[PDB]
Design a protein around this ligand. Sequence first.
Ligand SMILES: *[C@@H]1O[C@H](CO)[C@@H](O[C@@H]2O[C@H](CO)[C@@H](O)[C@H](O)[C@H]2NC(C)=O)[C@H](O)[C@H]1NC(C)=O
Ligand SMILES: *[C@@H]1O[C@H](CO)[C@@H](O[C@@H]2O[C@H](CO)[C@@H](O)[C@H](O)[C@H]2NC(C)=O)[C@H](O)[C@H]1NC(C)=O
Ligand SMILES: *[C@@H]1O[C@H](CO)[C@@H](O[C@@H]2O[C@H](CO)[C@@H](O)[C@H](O)[C@H]2NC(C)=O)[C@H](O)[C@H]1NC(C)=O
Ligand SMILES: *[C@@H]1O[C@H](CO)[C@@H](O)[C@H](O)[C@H]1NC(C)=O
Ligand SMILES: *[C@@H]1O[C@H](CO)[C@@H](O)[C@H](O)[C@H]1NC(C)=O
Ligand SMILES: *[C@@H]1O[C@H](CO)[C@@H](O)[C@H](O)[C@H]1NC(C)=O
Lengths: 197, 123, 113, 50, 49
Amino acid sequence: MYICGDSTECSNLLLQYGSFCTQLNRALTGIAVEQDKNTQEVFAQVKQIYKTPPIKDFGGFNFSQILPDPSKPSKRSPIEDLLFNKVTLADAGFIKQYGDCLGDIAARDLICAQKFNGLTVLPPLLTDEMIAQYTSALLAGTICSGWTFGAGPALQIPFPMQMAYRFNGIGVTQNVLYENQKLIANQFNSAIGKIQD
Amino acid sequence: FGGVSVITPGTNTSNQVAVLYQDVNCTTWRVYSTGSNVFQTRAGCLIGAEHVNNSYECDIPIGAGICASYQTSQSIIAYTMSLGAENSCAYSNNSIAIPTNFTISVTTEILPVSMTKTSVDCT
Amino acid sequence: GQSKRVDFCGKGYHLMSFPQSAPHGVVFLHVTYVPAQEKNFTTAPAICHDGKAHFPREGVFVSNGTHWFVTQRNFYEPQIITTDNTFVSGNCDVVIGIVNNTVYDPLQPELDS
Amino acid sequence: GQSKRVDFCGKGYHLMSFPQSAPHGVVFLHVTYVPAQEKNFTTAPAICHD
Amino acid sequence: SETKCTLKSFTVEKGIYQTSNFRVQPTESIVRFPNITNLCPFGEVFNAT
Ligand SMILES: *[C@@H]1O[C@H](CO)[C@@H](O[C@@H]2O[C@H](CO)[C@@H](O)[C@H](O)[C@H]2NC(C)=O)[C@H](O)[C@H]1NC(C)=O
Ligand SMILES: *[C@@H]1O[C@H](CO)[C@@H](O[C@@H]2O[C@H](CO)[C@@H](O)[C@H](O)[C@H]2NC(C)=O)[C@H](O)[C@H]1NC(C)=O
Ligand SMILES: *[C@@H]1O[C@H](CO)[C@@H](O[C@@H]2O[C@H](CO)[C@@H](O)[C@H](O)[C@H]2NC(C)=O)[C@H](O)[C@H]1NC(C)=O
Ligand SMILES: *[C@@H]1O[C@H](CO)[C@@H](O)[C@H](O)[C@H]1NC(C)=O
Ligand SMILES: *[C@@H]1O[C@H](CO)[C@@H](O)[C@H](O)[C@H]1NC(C)=O
Ligand SMILES: *[C@@H]1O[C@H](CO)[C@@H](O)[C@H](O)[C@H]1NC(C)=O
């Protein structure tokens, strides 16, 4: 398509070195495969899907900007919804019909120009909804059981004790956390709000 | 205008194939044939596969959440892939789970270290 | 060595590894510790003894149907809560969720005998 | 987990992290502990008792 | 000398260099044509009435 454009005489000449085209596509196919693989290695680490908990009092710790918003058509957290709105993609969806490119000629749409010359963009295996589900499972896991869900079975723990362990882990004795629990929870909640802004 | 790919069970098993038309909506379709078994997805119009409402693990990926496999009187089927096992926990502010026993597990990790060394005489 | 990087040297807690030769590469056998059977216990952040607040030194306060014990975090082996298993910081009016229990004192019986 | 690698999971002492989805990538929210007000004290390596 | 020419140098440092390939030369030639004794009909083609 790119080289000959349906010209028969060109196509017949192109065949003189057709092993070249096959090689170019082996290389591009290998790239496409890796892109789906990369996505799974980063997100699909835990195949146990934990559900987002009802929001309970976690000890003053507010996770509403990181957990999924159930009221939306796409259950993205408030932060995720912002991240998705800010990055702009070349087009919407992977279906472009012949009749759309034939009708909208005056439009000079770059996507149609690419397709008519043999350049095709393929869809991801994991959809944005699927990625959001992996993210939600990891957050649900962390809040409910800390790091234990990574190590093996998940073992439930009160959120504030999870934090106590995390403080001992940095060299600060846990009595500091409990004595200052309200302060720590408030600073945490404030910091998350600042990030979305 | 393009958009064609073929989903194949091995040819040492069967010669049934499904054909995906990436730029066809199917809802005179710019397809080679129909013959029923027409399923529309975000990745294109898939002709020659039965849609199944059960989720399974992915075998041959198609795209946009859809995978296919050859299953029983065997034919090509398509389905939305499973993302993992459903699991659960019960967050509570006054209880903890503590291990009482353990197991020893040994796993294997495989990594390449080197490739073939070559030399070429251009003349 | 013994790595503490999560899932770096296999899933679970890493204990040790053994390499094996392979053509064009290396295969690692990673030995890890994995928690198995587990039980659900009631818990608390602190013990209130004589009005002072006691925290575990190396463990968690765990309760069965009638009694409080202190256990190591990764293995259920109950110990009596004593003054040698805890440290004291502050008092019972600060910690949210402070249960009251006896913090056994190993010296008093010797002073009495 | 809880990494001890310096500045790997953000500046300060790492406590925990939360991933967020993004198109073509991942965004991490890293929660760290940072020392704040401080005081100057006299010090010594050891105490001589008896 | 082959190494020196490849590297464009009159000095070669320590190490292993690949140096072309082992080659041999032909020693004689062979010509094999069908044993045809007739001359082509040049007269008939070019000297026709
Ligand atoms: C977690 O924080 C959010 C703010 O980020 C709280 O939501 C706000 O609640 C007030 C009072 O009802 C409303 O006037 C605001 O409009 C809400 N803001 C948003 C963005 O929804 C939320 O209630 C807090 N959660 C908990 C459990 O305390
Ligand atoms: C330690 O730092 C925190 C701030 O991170 C201080 O808390 C603030 O104190 C002022 C003055 O009383 C209040 O107006 C603010 O509302 C408090 N902030 C929060 C988030 O609660 C705290 O007083 C400092 N403390 C010491 C050395 O004890
Ligand atoms: C909680 O643990 C304690 C200590 O093991 C159990 O109490 C003991 O039970 C045995 C009989 O099995 C008696 O001989 C001991 O004298 C008891 N100890 C004390 C201090 O009374 C207790 O039964 C366990 N609680 C529950 C609900 O299982
Ligand atoms: C196909 O066209 C219908 C309208 O008839 C539309 O609702 C649907 O989303 C289109 N399919 C895809 C995969 O975009
Ligand atoms: C847990 O929450 C309940 C309210 O749902 C409250 O009555 C109870 O005292 C809390 N316990 C702890 C340890 O915080
Ligand atoms: C044509 O005929 C002449 C005699 O008239 C002769 O000399 C000549 O060689 C002939 N040509 C060929 C190609 O035989």
